Structures are given as C-alpha cells and as structure tokens.
C-alpha cells in the first residue's frame, strides 16, 4: 500500500499461549478495534490470519502471521504464534521478534502446559515484558475462578523471572469484541463493553511495554524468520532488524547454516507491504534479495553487513535442565546427547560434550558444558537459548564462551 511513513515509534508485539486459548481471535479483534480510531489500520479477520490450507485442514494456527495496527501513541507489528505443542519451533521464531508478548490464557481452562512452555521460551529468545489477556471470560460466570486463574498465571510468570505480580492482566472476550466490530466496524471506545476491554489491552501494551533502546549505528543485522518467492519480484527474506540499517542497493551477507557465507544485493525493503526508504533497527521487514532463490536463503540464517559476523560451531554454555514437573525430561543425559538448539530464529542440531568426570546430567541440574553445532550459526556470548528434543523443551541455557 505505497510508502511507509514514520509518524510514531514502532514496537513489535505478539500473541503466545496454550492451544485454542484465543490468540488468533484476539489478534483479529485488535486490528478491528484499532481500525475504528485510526484509518491507517487495515482490518484482519480470523480467516485472513489462519489463511494457509494446512491451517484450515488442521484447524489450528501453524505459521506465525504478522499483522499491523497502531494506537495514538505507537505503531505495532504483531506476530501471532501457534499454541499447538507440535509447532513450538514456529512459536519460538515468532517470540524471537517480540519487544513484548501478550500471553493469552483462557479463563475457562486456566494455565495449561503451553502456557508454561511459551513463557519459558519467550524468556530464552529475549522477550523482555509480558502483558496478560485472560480470554473467554464470557464463558465463566464465577468470579472466584477468574481470580484463581489470574493468581495461577501471575505465579507461573514469577517462576520464569517475569514480574508476575506486576504484569497487567486484562480480562475480556476476543470473540465478542470481534463480533461487535463486525456488526459495527465504526464502534468507538466507550460504546461497547467487550471492545473497551480490547482498549484496556491496547492501553496496557502502550504503557507497560516500553519502546526498546535500539542501535542503528552498529552493523546491519537481521535474523531471518521466513523466506518466500514473490511472483515477478524474487526472493524475500523477512525478519525483525536487530541493529543497524538497510537500504535498497546495499550489499549484504547471508550468514549461517551453509558451509560458507554468500553475498547478495538488497533490491527491495518493505514493512507491511509498504515501501521503506530505509529499514532500521526494530522494523519488521521483508528484504528482497537479488540472485538467490528460496532454496539459497532460509529461516535461521542472518542478513548482515558483509564481514561483520563470523558464524560459529562450538561454545561453552551454562544450562538449566528442566525438571519433569516443568515438562522436561524424566531421565538424565550423557555426553553425545544430540538435541536441537534454538537461538533467536535459528534451530540447529548440536552435540553435548560434558567435562571429563561429569558422566551424566539430571533434570533440575544447573550445569556447564560444551556444544558443537552441526552447522555454523551467528552466535555471541551472553546469548540465551532453548534446548529441545523429541518434541519437548528439555533445557534453557546461555552462551558463556565462544570456542570456535
Ligand atoms: N466463548 C469464546 N470463545 C472464544 C473466544 N475467543 C476465542 N474463542 C474460540 O476459541 C477457539 C480458538 O480460538 P483461536 O483464536 O483459534 O485460538 P488460538 O489460541 O489462536 N489457537 P492456536 O493455538 O491453534 O493458534 C475458537 O473456536 C474461537 O471461537 C472468546 O472470547 N469467547
Ligand atoms: O509481498 C511481500 O511480502 C514483499 C514483496 C516484496 C517485499 Br521486500 O516483501
Ligand atoms: Mg491461533
Ligand atoms: N496463521
């Protein structure tokens, strides 16, 4: 829709939470509610978000979706994540883009295993703040149950070092708000009970999730979240720009996952299908890459200023191994354990090598060991990561030292 005009600060948010708790319905409601007060917002219905044939077939979100909305204060890109246990990988890549997450929890069900898992994982890809939306209150008459659900959620957040007692917990119905906006798309704040709860959420997002300190002077770095072919344009890599700036005509390097880095020229930069003169740190963009196909760039690589990043394969890490009560392993593991490691949008198999004398690591252990990744990836000291294996989260770590 033409050129992107920067009128206000930009923040990346998104929806996480257990399967079916109402993330996508809420995402759609946010677009409709905000669109009444700001005509730059294009509304997105439920089927515009869960749009893929496989999402229709399976009846769940599978792919992250990005939607745009804005308030008087700020412009938002919103990443809606799947809740299903089998699509955690996609959720991780989504959370890796968020400056703050909206944790959706059904009032009728309370916190559930992916409520816990998403909180834990959001932390490990750097989500700094969480707002809670307690959804489906239209289904729950009993005030006592609502208070219990809120108490449990606040306590759950405390377990993962979020300020659980301080987070806003907004109670409402994404569906009833969305219904009201369908019957009157011009419904303004103060007119409807359910719509006003969405405004309470928007207010909490505005005021509780700060605009991050970003650095546009450091070398360009954009973790790639997705890649696709646009008919008649070419290959687009999407992602949140971590730092620096990118302009059409810039040479960039595609770093990680391949034996060697390759260079390409950026031939387009857009945010929400609007042309950007310059992509800057924080922007949620699509970057058109010349001379590469969608088989030559992939999720988990990073786009970088040429020569600015050396990818790595081997590192030391401080790792907490989840207890089974946290959805972790029942039993311990040995050197040669071979799980998946998640750094930002990157997912890669790695080999655990314990010190001489450390035979075994048990659930509950805080331990240090060495990991050798099977492919090079953009890494740095202090970077947090998650460890998963066999479809479950088994560990949380931070890179302490880069060895190679
Ligand atoms: N009664 C009621 N039902 C709701 C509400 N919000 C969502 N639902 C229902 O809950 C179901 C799941 O909604 P959905 O938005 O797809 O949830 P999700 O969290 O995005 N699912 P997933 O984890 O697969 O992405 C749908 O049947 C939807 O109609 C609400 O406020 N009230
Ligand atoms: O359709 C897209 O998402 C797109 C096209 C060109 C760019 Br850059 O992003
Ligand atoms: Mg969904
Ligand atoms: N989706």
Outline the fold blueprint.
Blueprint: E1 10-16, H1 23-37, H2 46-49, H3 53-58, E2 65-70, E3 75-80, H4 88-95, E4 101-106, H5 113-124, E5 130-135, H6 143-159, E6 169-171, H7 174-183, H8 193-208, E7 221-223, E8 226-230, E9 234-240, E10 245-246, E11 251-255, E12 262-271, E13 274-275, E14 279-280, E15 284-289, E16 302-304, E17 312-321, E18 333-334, E19 340-343, E20 346-353, E21 360-361, E22 366-377, E23 384-389, E24 392-402
Parallel strand pairs: 1-3, 1-4, 4-5, 5-6
Antiparallel strand pairs: 2-3, 7-16, 8-9, 9-15, 10-14, 11-12, 11-16, 12-13, 12-15, 17-22, 17-24, 18-21, 19-20, 19-23, 20-22, 23-24
Helix pairs in contact: 1-7, 1-8, 7-8
Magnesium ion binds next to helix 1.
């Amino acid at each position: 829709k033409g050129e992107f005009v920067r009128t206000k600060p930009h923040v990346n948010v998104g929806t996480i939470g257990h399967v079916d708790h109402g993330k996508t319905t809420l995402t759609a409601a946010l677009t409709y509610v905000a669109a009444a007060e700001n005509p730059n917002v294009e509304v997105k219905d439920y089927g515009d978000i869960d749009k893929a044939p496989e999402e229709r077939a399976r009846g769940i979100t599978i792919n992250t979706a990005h939607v745009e909305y804005e308030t008087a204060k700020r412009h938002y890109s919103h990443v809606d994540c799947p809740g299903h246990a089998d699509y955690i990988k996609n959720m991780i890549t989504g959370a890796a883009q968020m400056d703050g997450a909206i944790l959706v929890v059904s009032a009728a069900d309370g916190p559930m295993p992916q409520t816990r898992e998403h909180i834990l994982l959001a932390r490990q890809v750097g989500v700094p703040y969480i707002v809670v939306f307690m959804n489906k209150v239209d289904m729950v008459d009993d005030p006592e149950l609502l208070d219990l659900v809120e108490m449990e959620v606040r306590d759950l957040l405390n377990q993962y070092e979020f300020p659980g007692d301080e987070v806003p917990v907004i109670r409402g119905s994404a569906l009833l708000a969305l219904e009201q906006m369908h019957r009157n798309p011009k419904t303004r704040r103060g007119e409807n009970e359910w719509v006003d709860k969405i405004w309470e959420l928007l207010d909490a997002i505005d005021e509780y999730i700060p605009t991050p300190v970003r650095d546009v002077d450091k070398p360009f770095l954009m973790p790639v979240e997705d890649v696709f072919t646009i008919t008649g344009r070419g290959t687009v890599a999407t992602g949140r720009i971590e730092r620096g700036k990118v302009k059409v005509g810039d040479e960039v390097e595609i770093v990680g996952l391949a034996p060697e880095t390759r260079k390409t020229v950026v031939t387009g930069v857009e945010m929400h299908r609007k042309t950007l003169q310059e992509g800057i740190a924080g922007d949620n963009v699509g970057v058109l890459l010349r001379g590469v196909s969608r088989e030559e760039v992939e999720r988990g690589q990073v786009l970088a200023k040429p020569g600015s990043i050396t990818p790595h394969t081997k590192f030391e890490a401080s790792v907490y191994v989840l207890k089974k009560e946290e959805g972790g392993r029942h039993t311990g593991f040995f050197s040669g354990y071979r799980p998946q490691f998640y750094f930002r949008t990157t997912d890669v198999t790695g080999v655990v090598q314990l010190p001489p004398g450390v035979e075994m690591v048990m659930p509950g252990d805080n331990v240090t060991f060495t990991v050798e990744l099977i492919k090079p990836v953009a890494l740095e000291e202090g970077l947090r990561f998650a460890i998963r294996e066999g479809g479950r989260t088994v560990g949380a770590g931070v890179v302490t030292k880069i060895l190679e």
